[PDB]
Amino acid sequence: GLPVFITPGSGQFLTTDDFQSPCALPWYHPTKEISIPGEVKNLVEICQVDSLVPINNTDTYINSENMYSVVLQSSINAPDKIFSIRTDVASQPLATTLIGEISSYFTHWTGSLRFSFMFCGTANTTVKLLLAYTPPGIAEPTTRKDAMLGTHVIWDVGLQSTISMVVPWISASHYRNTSPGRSTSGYITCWYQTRLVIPPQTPPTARLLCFVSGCKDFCLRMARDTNLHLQSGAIAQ
Amino acid sequence: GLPVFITPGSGQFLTTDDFQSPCALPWYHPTKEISIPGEVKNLVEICQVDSLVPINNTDTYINSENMYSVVLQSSINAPDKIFSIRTDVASQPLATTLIGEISSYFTHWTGSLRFSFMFCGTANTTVKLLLAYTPPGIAEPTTRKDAMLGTHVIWDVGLQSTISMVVPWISASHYRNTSPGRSTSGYITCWYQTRLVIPPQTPPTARLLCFVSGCKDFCLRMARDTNLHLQSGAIAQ
Amino acid sequence: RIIQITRGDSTITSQDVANAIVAYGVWPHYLSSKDASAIDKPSQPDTSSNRFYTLRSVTWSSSSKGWWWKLPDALKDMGIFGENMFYHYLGRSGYTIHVQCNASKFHQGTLIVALIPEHQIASALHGNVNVGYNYTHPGETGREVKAETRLNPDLQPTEEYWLNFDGTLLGNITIFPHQFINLRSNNSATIIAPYVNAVPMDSMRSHNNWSLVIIPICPLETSSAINTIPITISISPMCAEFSGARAKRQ
Amino acid sequence: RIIQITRGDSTITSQDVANAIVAYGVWPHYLSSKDASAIDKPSQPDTSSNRFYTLRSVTWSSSSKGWWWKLPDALKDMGIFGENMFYHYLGRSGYTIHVQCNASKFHQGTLIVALIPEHQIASALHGNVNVGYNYTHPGETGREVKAETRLNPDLQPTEEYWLNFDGTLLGNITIFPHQFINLRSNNSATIIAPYVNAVPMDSMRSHNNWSLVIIPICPLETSSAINTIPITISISPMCAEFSGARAKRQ
Amino acid sequence: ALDAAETGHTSSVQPEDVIETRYVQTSQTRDEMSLESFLGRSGCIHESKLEVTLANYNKENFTVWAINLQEMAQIRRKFELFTYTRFDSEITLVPCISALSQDIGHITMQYMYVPPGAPVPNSRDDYAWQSGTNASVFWQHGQAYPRFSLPFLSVASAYYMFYDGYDEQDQNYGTANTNNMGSLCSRIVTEKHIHKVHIMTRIYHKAKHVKAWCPRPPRALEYTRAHRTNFKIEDRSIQTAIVTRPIITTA
Amino acid sequence: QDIGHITMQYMYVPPGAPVPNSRDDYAWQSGTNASVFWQHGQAYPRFSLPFLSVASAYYMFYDGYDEQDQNYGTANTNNMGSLCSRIVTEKHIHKVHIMT
């Protein structure tokens, strides 16, 4: 036979290998691909989907819809903070979003994130609000003016339902690690730019729902078996 | 399958082998090479760098800058020897130079060496000095006239700072072994060609610093895990 | 933000709605000679069944938890559609769906509507159990979600709406074609879908080839004495087809 | 052997100097669209910060042992440069550096100046220890080398100058872009460098992307009563850029 | 920058809208994010543990397993991401012999794909170990890891990841209807011998030449019941991947 | 007195993969992690690993910190995660050391 000689890396199985292989079932033929709707080629189209943050991750809301929602108080003359979050894609709560899980299935990420926000309160009601981002190396802001020094948007709550805005990609490195240990990507932070004003005898309350998705900018590397989910023992049947 | 038959040298690992190998991480893609400054292709560009000899390798200077330096005595009417060294690239002290270490990482060497010398004394001061080389098979010289029979340079200490000169390659063989055991390459030797003259009430002293590098002529073979450095036990972390 | 809708004989509008995304952009169509399995020229009731039909009134409150349906079973009683379904071993159809949900300018709250595929519901109870036919196939009567005492619980599906009744997170549910009834944004919401399966057509009564979910993501309120609003849904089947005619199915 | 220098608003000369080698021959420049990571159009203060600034006087003696700085931290207080650095998560800049060191015709001694990369300093103490931020980031105040009693020694860097403070031999230090102040050869010395990193731009306050070392290779002396001379260093940043604007860093 | 998320369409798309950007060669490939990547890495599927019984070596020393992707979580969650998927399959066998005795000697082991309505082997001596057309394959001590390519099998266009009904007389709700692939099987081929041993095969697969159909949300909680989407575990509570914090104004 | 047949697993554990805690950990399953096998009498395993870094090149040195100021130098930048190894053969009587 041809004189051949064998390199190391022979005779192993690697779960992430790439090769031809022989057939168990020669002469077989598969069923034809009918034109089923809902084609897909990549994970990024899933990233493009807006999904809700369970923003309001606490005991009093977790076992319910309400952890996707925040409640606003039209009673308050103040500039102050409504909420804040990290921005690291596999941090809590963001990891629990589908982009979060897809990022949690991965080790590297890059590109800017889309964020979106609906004024879910009574149609008769008005406000304008500050949604802001904090470039890190610094504490999460404690005045509205701090957030005004960050990159931010002021929401003209017009007839249109939703404000949508982007955390710009400002990683030193072209990628960042998907889960921080002792590390940070920056903060989302939210504030009363005006007070919220309902008209008289409206419910003394309002709701806000918050969305995120990958921008056209977004991408991942180092697919890894995700942090997000655990199996204990045998899966019964 | 094709009739094949297997030669010896199969199934070993050689730390110095050469082959293709299969990927652990298929479909991955590396980060782009940005145009970082400080490109390199070969070790010879490092050889081209002048580095100081720790010429003055003794107890009284070793734990300090001063082993890179020699002190001259303007008080002396004499022709006599200032210093001398071997020329074998991996001999002490030369081995400790970066060309020394690179040679110490290697078994064969060839080509002529550049040597350079600054009159580090007071700007007002004058001398001319003999830098000389001894072709071996012979003892290291004991008169200045001996060195004058060797290949040598007399330093016109003009406005210009430095004299630079070459030990010619005069190996019988096109290469020489990088470290001698019971063997020799020749000597550097240094002498008062004139007395050193300071003008009155100058410091009664002067300094000289000495440099070496590979010439355009220089090259190495048989890269080997260097003599120069030792690991004892485990490297802790 | 205004639409009118016309299928088979019947018409629909909202003058406060944002248009449906067509599911995956595929406008509904009949099977192809290139993809088909069934041999006959199949049953095209066309206008007489690719027309609207609508469900009994549900109604909702701040205390309400959710509602859903499984299709075609949710439409088994829709005259021509219903019997043409029951008399064939197989068929296929897409759907146009609109949910009717007007409030005053003086209400707040929001529902998510999700069209959803096989949506394989989890049991209520733990262990060696699975959902019973009566509950997977609630008919047009549907499954509202309630706090208490549903009998035969071992065969009941779970009530756990924020776990999408299958152990998946809500809020990621927007992965499917979906809309929001948001009382500020709109007074109604709409979605349309082609047929879908791993198979070119399917055993209608035996498998709910599509499903529809509506969830109170934000609680209903107004200060007005009208503390609650109905919801109703209307559906037209699309390109509806049936094959393997025999007796009426039981 | 004469030069004049002009950056942003400010000018420098020596009339007894031999020109800088440009580090690796790469004259300083802005980032490229081909290589960049950051998305914004970045901050170009140009003339208002690609201009000279200079450090407090050190001074030296025959007894003196060495000095160094880490950049950009050594310039954190240089007005526009300093704050533009502190207000951004990232930036990049090269440098032009000149060291000022005139003596009389009647002095001897020599310093080596080395520009040096990440120059990852070793601890003073043995064992499970590493350098503390206060000392890696000495600011413009810099690190002169001294014989005694530096507190928090466990977090101090080593003083071992001839081991380049990292366990590498001096005299091979000429591997980097370097010059000598030699009092006969010159009255000053100069070096210029582009930006460098493994990354197209960097977290300025978090990482000293360049460093600068000056060492008394040969002892200072004169017979004159002026037994000591100051040294000072001036730097201009080059093509300086900043990105990810937010609050002032602490 | 303003939109109606209620449309169902994704929100205001463009990053350049609210940042005065510099031009950047954003030039990072999505190819690792491809389906022929993400599905197209192998993982373990099932665990064929056996003991070599002595007292009736001829009877007991074989196993059979119902083929499913539903009882190892990571692989399951790849596929529990869609309505349907289609792929050809690298299949890879990691046979392992564990000694309960001073030696193992030579050992040889059979596997068979048992498509449904093949006669299932009842005995380590069953005539069903003969395999004129069933895909049966062999391993033995010191041999490399076996593998084969299995093409896409289904009677339909794609495997049901989920199903919404029954086999026509109304039990086994969901994939337990549609996903009758039959079973893998294994059996010691060496005849009766003195060494008490356990054989364990970890079985692996990678889907390649993949296609997938309508994405669906990821599993939030521990698995429970293979075919069934059940998740409310006995004497337990629904501790999802979401983690709580003290206040929503603190990151 | 003998070793018998033995088989051994390796895995590259990139950071934020779930680290195996146990020789029986589900983390030995490896749908996408580079995991590879060796056994007695098999030739030396090898693989080609491409250049990994999030940056253009590996830091041989670094001059600062992870942003909250500890681990000075490469201990910041050089988080490649870890290699791992584990015996794949089940419980057996032979007391053995494996060295790779």
mmCIF file of N, CA and C in Angstrom, chain C residues 56-138:
data_model
loop_
_atom_site.group_PDB
_atom_site.id
_atom_site.type_symbol
_atom_site.label_atom_id
_atom_site.label_comp_id
_atom_site.label_asym_id
_atom_site.label_seq_id
_atom_site.Cartn_x
_atom_site.Cartn_y
_atom_site.Cartn_z
ATOM 1 N N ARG C 56 -67.008 32.658 21.777
ATOM 2 C CA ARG C 56 -67.752 33.188 22.929
ATOM 3 C C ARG C 56 -66.948 34.239 23.675
ATOM 4 N N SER C 57 -67.627 35.203 24.276
ATOM 5 C CA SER C 57 -66.988 36.250 25.070
ATOM 6 C C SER C 57 -66.262 35.675 26.285
ATOM 7 N N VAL C 58 -64.944 35.848 26.336
ATOM 8 C CA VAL C 58 -64.223 35.921 27.615
ATOM 9 C C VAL C 58 -64.319 37.351 28.136
ATOM 10 N N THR C 59 -64.023 37.572 29.403
ATOM 11 C CA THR C 59 -63.899 38.922 29.948
ATOM 12 C C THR C 59 -62.822 38.957 31.001
ATOM 13 N N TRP C 60 -62.199 40.114 31.187
ATOM 14 C CA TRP C 60 -61.026 40.213 32.036
ATOM 15 C C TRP C 60 -61.041 41.420 32.955
ATOM 16 N N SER C 61 -60.199 41.281 33.962
ATOM 17 C CA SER C 61 -60.111 42.026 35.202
ATOM 18 C C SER C 61 -58.642 42.123 35.582
ATOM 19 N N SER C 62 -58.302 43.031 36.485
ATOM 20 C CA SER C 62 -56.984 43.049 37.126
ATOM 21 C C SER C 62 -56.592 41.680 37.706
ATOM 22 N N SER C 63 -57.550 40.915 38.238
ATOM 23 C CA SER C 63 -57.317 39.587 38.824
ATOM 24 C C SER C 63 -57.115 38.466 37.796
ATOM 25 N N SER C 64 -57.453 38.689 36.530
ATOM 26 C CA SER C 64 -57.379 37.667 35.482
ATOM 27 C C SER C 64 -55.947 37.234 35.155
ATOM 28 N N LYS C 65 -55.755 35.993 34.689
ATOM 29 C CA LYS C 65 -54.410 35.411 34.506
ATOM 30 C C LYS C 65 -54.023 34.996 33.089
ATOM 31 N N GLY C 66 -54.957 34.742 32.173
ATOM 32 C CA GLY C 66 -54.602 34.318 30.812
ATOM 33 C C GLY C 66 -55.645 33.471 30.099
ATOM 34 N N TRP C 67 -55.487 33.338 28.784
ATOM 35 C CA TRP C 67 -56.364 32.536 27.941
ATOM 36 C C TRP C 67 -55.610 31.978 26.732
ATOM 37 N N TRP C 68 -56.027 30.830 26.208
ATOM 38 C CA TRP C 68 -55.477 30.291 24.966
ATOM 39 C C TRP C 68 -56.407 29.289 24.291
ATOM 40 N N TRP C 69 -56.083 28.985 23.035
ATOM 41 C CA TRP C 69 -56.788 28.046 22.172
ATOM 42 C C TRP C 69 -55.828 27.253 21.297
ATOM 43 N N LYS C 70 -56.287 26.111 20.803
ATOM 44 C CA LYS C 70 -55.517 25.224 19.944
ATOM 45 C C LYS C 70 -56.334 24.922 18.694
ATOM 46 N N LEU C 71 -55.702 25.013 17.538
ATOM 47 C CA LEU C 71 -56.361 25.102 16.249
ATOM 48 C C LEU C 71 -55.902 23.929 15.394
ATOM 49 N N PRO C 72 -56.806 23.297 14.644
ATOM 50 C CA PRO C 72 -58.148 23.765 14.337
ATOM 51 C C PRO C 72 -59.208 23.502 15.407
ATOM 52 N N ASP C 73 -58.905 22.811 16.502
ATOM 53 C CA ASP C 73 -59.941 22.341 17.428
ATOM 54 C C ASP C 73 -60.848 23.460 17.945
ATOM 55 N N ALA C 74 -60.273 24.627 18.201
ATOM 56 C CA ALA C 74 -60.995 25.809 18.631
ATOM 57 C C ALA C 74 -62.092 26.266 17.666
ATOM 58 N N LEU C 75 -62.115 25.732 16.454
ATOM 59 C CA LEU C 75 -63.045 26.079 15.399
ATOM 60 C C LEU C 75 -63.861 24.876 14.922
ATOM 61 N N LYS C 76 -63.831 23.757 15.652
ATOM 62 C CA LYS C 76 -64.540 22.524 15.281
ATOM 63 C C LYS C 76 -66.037 22.720 15.037
ATOM 64 N N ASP C 77 -66.627 23.758 15.619
ATOM 65 C CA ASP C 77 -68.060 24.037 15.543
ATOM 66 C C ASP C 77 -68.425 25.132 14.521
ATOM 67 N N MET C 78 -67.465 25.593 13.716
ATOM 68 C CA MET C 78 -67.655 26.715 12.782
ATOM 69 C C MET C 78 -68.267 26.294 11.454
ATOM 70 N N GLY C 79 -69.456 25.705 11.547
ATOM 71 C CA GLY C 79 -70.242 25.213 10.425
ATOM 72 C C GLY C 79 -69.373 24.494 9.411
ATOM 73 N N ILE C 80 -69.380 25.014 8.179
ATOM 74 C CA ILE C 80 -68.658 24.437 7.048
ATOM 75 C C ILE C 80 -67.245 24.042 7.440
ATOM 76 N N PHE C 81 -66.500 24.922 8.107
ATOM 77 C CA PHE C 81 -65.137 24.593 8.498
ATOM 78 C C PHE C 81 -65.106 23.368 9.411
ATOM 79 N N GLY C 82 -65.936 23.415 10.441
ATOM 80 C CA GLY C 82 -66.045 22.394 11.455
ATOM 81 C C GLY C 82 -66.388 21.031 10.879
ATOM 82 N N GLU C 83 -67.511 20.910 10.190
ATOM 83 C CA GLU C 83 -67.837 19.614 9.609
ATOM 84 C C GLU C 83 -66.834 19.213 8.529
ATOM 85 N N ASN C 84 -66.389 20.106 7.643
ATOM 86 C CA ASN C 84 -65.459 19.684 6.595
ATOM 87 C C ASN C 84 -64.183 19.108 7.220
ATOM 88 N N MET C 85 -63.735 19.720 8.311
ATOM 89 C CA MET C 85 -62.729 19.141 9.174
ATOM 90 C C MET C 85 -63.142 17.752 9.672
ATOM 91 N N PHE C 86 -64.248 17.617 10.397
ATOM 92 C CA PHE C 86 -64.620 16.336 10.992
ATOM 93 C C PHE C 86 -64.866 15.208 9.987
ATOM 94 N N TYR C 87 -65.249 15.492 8.749
ATOM 95 C CA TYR C 87 -65.557 14.458 7.757
ATOM 96 C C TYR C 87 -64.341 13.971 6.976
ATOM 97 N N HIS C 88 -63.189 14.613 7.126
ATOM 98 C CA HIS C 88 -61.963 14.195 6.463
ATOM 99 C C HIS C 88 -60.945 13.669 7.462
ATOM 100 N N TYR C 89 -60.175 12.658 7.067
ATOM 101 C CA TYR C 89 -59.037 12.246 7.882
ATOM 102 C C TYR C 89 -57.962 13.337 7.934
ATOM 103 N N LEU C 90 -57.735 14.059 6.834
ATOM 104 C CA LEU C 90 -56.721 15.104 6.760
ATOM 105 C C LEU C 90 -57.268 16.417 6.236
ATOM 106 N N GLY C 91 -56.548 17.483 6.545
ATOM 107 C CA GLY C 91 -56.667 18.763 5.869
ATOM 108 C C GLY C 91 -55.474 19.660 6.164
ATOM 109 N N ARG C 92 -55.566 20.913 5.739
ATOM 110 C CA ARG C 92 -54.654 21.993 6.144
ATOM 111 C C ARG C 92 -55.338 23.340 6.018
ATOM 112 N N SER C 93 -54.965 24.290 6.860
ATOM 113 C CA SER C 93 -55.378 25.686 6.710
ATOM 114 C C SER C 93 -54.477 26.616 7.512
ATOM 115 N N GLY C 94 -54.180 27.785 6.953
ATOM 116 C CA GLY C 94 -53.690 28.916 7.738
ATOM 117 C C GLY C 94 -54.843 29.669 8.395
ATOM 118 N N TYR C 95 -54.561 30.843 8.942
ATOM 119 C CA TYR C 95 -55.573 31.641 9.616
ATOM 120 C C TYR C 95 -55.288 33.142 9.512
ATOM 121 N N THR C 96 -56.331 33.959 9.449
ATOM 122 C CA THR C 96 -56.269 35.377 9.821
ATOM 123 C C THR C 96 -56.991 35.518 11.146
ATOM 124 N N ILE C 97 -56.365 36.133 12.141
ATOM 125 C CA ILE C 97 -56.932 36.318 13.472
ATOM 126 C C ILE C 97 -56.878 37.787 13.849
ATOM 127 N N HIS C 98 -57.975 38.283 14.392
ATOM 128 C CA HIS C 98 -58.042 39.599 15.000
ATOM 129 C C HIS C 98 -58.711 39.434 16.365
ATOM 130 N N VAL C 99 -58.148 40.079 17.379
ATOM 131 C CA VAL C 99 -58.659 40.103 18.749
ATOM 132 C C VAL C 99 -59.256 41.475 19.067
ATOM 133 N N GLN C 100 -60.471 41.487 19.603
ATOM 134 C CA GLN C 100 -61.281 42.685 19.796
ATOM 135 C C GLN C 100 -61.371 43.067 21.267
ATOM 136 N N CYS C 101 -60.889 44.271 21.579
ATOM 137 C CA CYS C 101 -60.446 44.596 22.931
ATOM 138 C C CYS C 101 -60.480 46.106 23.219
ATOM 139 N N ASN C 102 -61.455 46.840 22.688
ATOM 140 C CA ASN C 102 -61.494 48.288 22.901
ATOM 141 C C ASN C 102 -61.759 48.623 24.371
ATOM 142 N N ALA C 103 -61.172 49.719 24.826
ATOM 143 C CA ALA C 103 -61.406 50.329 26.129
ATOM 144 C C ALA C 103 -61.669 51.826 25.930
ATOM 145 N N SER C 104 -61.798 52.600 27.004
ATOM 146 C CA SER C 104 -61.803 54.059 26.857
ATOM 147 C C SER C 104 -60.374 54.609 26.795
ATOM 148 N N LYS C 105 -60.227 55.888 26.438
ATOM 149 C CA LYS C 105 -58.977 56.660 26.607
ATOM 150 C C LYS C 105 -58.462 56.680 28.057
ATOM 151 N N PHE C 106 -59.307 56.257 28.985
ATOM 152 C CA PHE C 106 -59.193 56.329 30.433
ATOM 153 C C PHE C 106 -58.956 54.956 31.093
ATOM 154 N N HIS C 107 -58.427 53.993 30.346
ATOM 155 C CA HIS C 107 -58.025 52.680 30.853
ATOM 156 C C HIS C 107 -56.525 52.455 30.661
ATOM 157 N N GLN C 108 -55.930 51.603 31.491
ATOM 158 C CA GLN C 108 -54.574 51.087 31.306
ATOM 159 C C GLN C 108 -54.500 49.603 31.637
ATOM 160 N N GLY C 109 -53.384 48.994 31.262
ATOM 161 C CA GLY C 109 -53.247 47.552 31.114
ATOM 162 C C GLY C 109 -52.794 47.209 29.698
ATOM 163 N N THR C 110 -52.340 45.982 29.486
ATOM 164 C CA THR C 110 -51.870 45.500 28.183
ATOM 165 C C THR C 110 -51.924 43.987 28.168
ATOM 166 N N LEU C 111 -52.250 43.422 27.016
ATOM 167 C CA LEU C 111 -52.182 41.993 26.777
ATOM 168 C C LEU C 111 -51.115 41.738 25.731
ATOM 169 N N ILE C 112 -50.366 40.653 25.854
ATOM 170 C CA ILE C 112 -49.635 40.132 24.703
ATOM 171 C C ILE C 112 -50.491 39.061 24.064
ATOM 172 N N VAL C 113 -50.626 39.117 22.742
ATOM 173 C CA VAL C 113 -51.126 38.006 21.939
ATOM 174 C C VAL C 113 -49.959 37.368 21.210
ATOM 175 N N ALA C 114 -49.835 36.058 21.334
ATOM 176 C CA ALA C 114 -48.874 35.261 20.599
ATOM 177 C C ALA C 114 -49.611 34.172 19.829
ATOM 178 N N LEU C 115 -49.453 34.171 18.510
ATOM 179 C CA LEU C 115 -49.624 32.943 17.757
ATOM 180 C C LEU C 115 -48.489 32.018 18.175
ATOM 181 N N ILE C 116 -48.753 30.733 18.344
ATOM 182 C CA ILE C 116 -47.737 29.801 18.799
ATOM 183 C C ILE C 116 -47.919 28.430 18.145
ATOM 184 N N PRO C 117 -46.831 27.738 17.782
ATOM 185 C CA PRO C 117 -46.874 26.409 17.182
ATOM 186 C C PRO C 117 -47.397 25.306 18.110
ATOM 187 N N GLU C 118 -46.750 24.145 18.128
ATOM 188 C CA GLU C 118 -47.282 22.933 18.750
ATOM 189 C C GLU C 118 -47.440 23.066 20.256
ATOM 190 N N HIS C 119 -46.675 23.986 20.851
ATOM 191 C CA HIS C 119 -46.981 24.546 22.157
ATOM 192 C C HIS C 119 -47.335 23.476 23.182
ATOM 193 N N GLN C 120 -46.452 22.488 23.269
ATOM 194 C CA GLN C 120 -46.775 21.195 23.836
ATOM 195 C C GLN C 120 -46.914 21.350 25.336
ATOM 196 N N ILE C 121 -48.144 21.407 25.812
ATOM 197 C CA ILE C 121 -48.405 21.890 27.159
ATOM 198 C C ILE C 121 -47.924 20.876 28.186
ATOM 199 N N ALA C 122 -47.342 21.351 29.280
ATOM 200 C CA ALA C 122 -46.938 20.525 30.409
ATOM 201 C C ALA C 122 -48.135 20.159 31.302
ATOM 202 N N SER C 123 -48.067 19.028 31.998
ATOM 203 C CA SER C 123 -49.067 18.642 32.999
ATOM 204 C C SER C 123 -49.142 19.621 34.167
ATOM 205 N N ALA C 124 -50.268 19.652 34.874
ATOM 206 C CA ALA C 124 -50.332 20.305 36.176
ATOM 207 C C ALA C 124 -49.514 19.533 37.218
ATOM 208 N N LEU C 125 -49.853 18.260 37.419
ATOM 209 C CA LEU C 125 -49.194 17.417 38.409
ATOM 210 C C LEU C 125 -47.782 17.030 37.950
ATOM 211 N N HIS C 126 -46.920 16.689 38.899
ATOM 212 C CA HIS C 126 -45.611 16.065 38.672
ATOM 213 C C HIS C 126 -45.705 14.619 38.160
ATOM 214 N N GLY C 127 -44.564 14.057 37.759
ATOM 215 C CA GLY C 127 -44.389 12.608 37.625
ATOM 216 C C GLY C 127 -44.902 12.013 36.315
ATOM 217 N N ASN C 128 -45.269 10.733 36.347
ATOM 218 C CA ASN C 128 -45.702 9.981 35.169
ATOM 219 C C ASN C 128 -47.142 10.327 34.756
ATOM 220 N N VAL C 129 -47.305 11.511 34.184
ATOM 221 C CA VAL C 129 -48.594 12.052 33.756
ATOM 222 C C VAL C 129 -48.464 12.788 32.428
ATOM 223 N N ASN C 130 -49.577 12.992 31.738
ATOM 224 C CA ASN C 130 -49.655 13.739 30.484
ATOM 225 C C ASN C 130 -51.059 14.345 30.317
ATOM 226 N N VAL C 131 -51.230 15.309 29.417
ATOM 227 C CA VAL C 131 -52.503 16.028 29.285
ATOM 228 C C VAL C 131 -53.567 15.174 28.589
ATOM 229 N N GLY C 132 -54.778 15.151 29.144
ATOM 230 C CA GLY C 132 -55.941 14.459 28.580
ATOM 231 C C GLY C 132 -56.640 15.225 27.452
ATOM 232 N N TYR C 133 -57.217 14.483 26.507
ATOM 233 C CA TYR C 133 -57.741 15.030 25.252
ATOM 234 C C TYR C 133 -58.764 16.149 25.460
ATOM 235 N N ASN C 134 -59.634 15.994 26.454
ATOM 236 C CA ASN C 134 -60.679 16.965 26.765
ATOM 237 C C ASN C 134 -60.133 18.377 26.995
ATOM 238 N N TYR C 135 -58.897 18.468 27.465
ATOM 239 C CA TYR C 135 -58.285 19.716 27.872
ATOM 240 C C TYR C 135 -57.360 20.241 26.788
ATOM 241 N N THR C 136 -56.614 19.372 26.104
ATOM 242 C CA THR C 136 -55.841 19.788 24.924
ATOM 243 C C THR C 136 -56.739 20.271 23.807
ATOM 244 N N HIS C 137 -57.942 19.721 23.752
ATOM 245 C CA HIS C 137 -58.956 20.043 22.781
ATOM 246 C C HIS C 137 -60.169 20.626 23.506
ATOM 247 N N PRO C 138 -60.060 21.854 24.034
ATOM 248 C CA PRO C 138 -61.141 22.512 24.748
ATOM 249 C C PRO C 138 -62.243 23.010 23.813
#
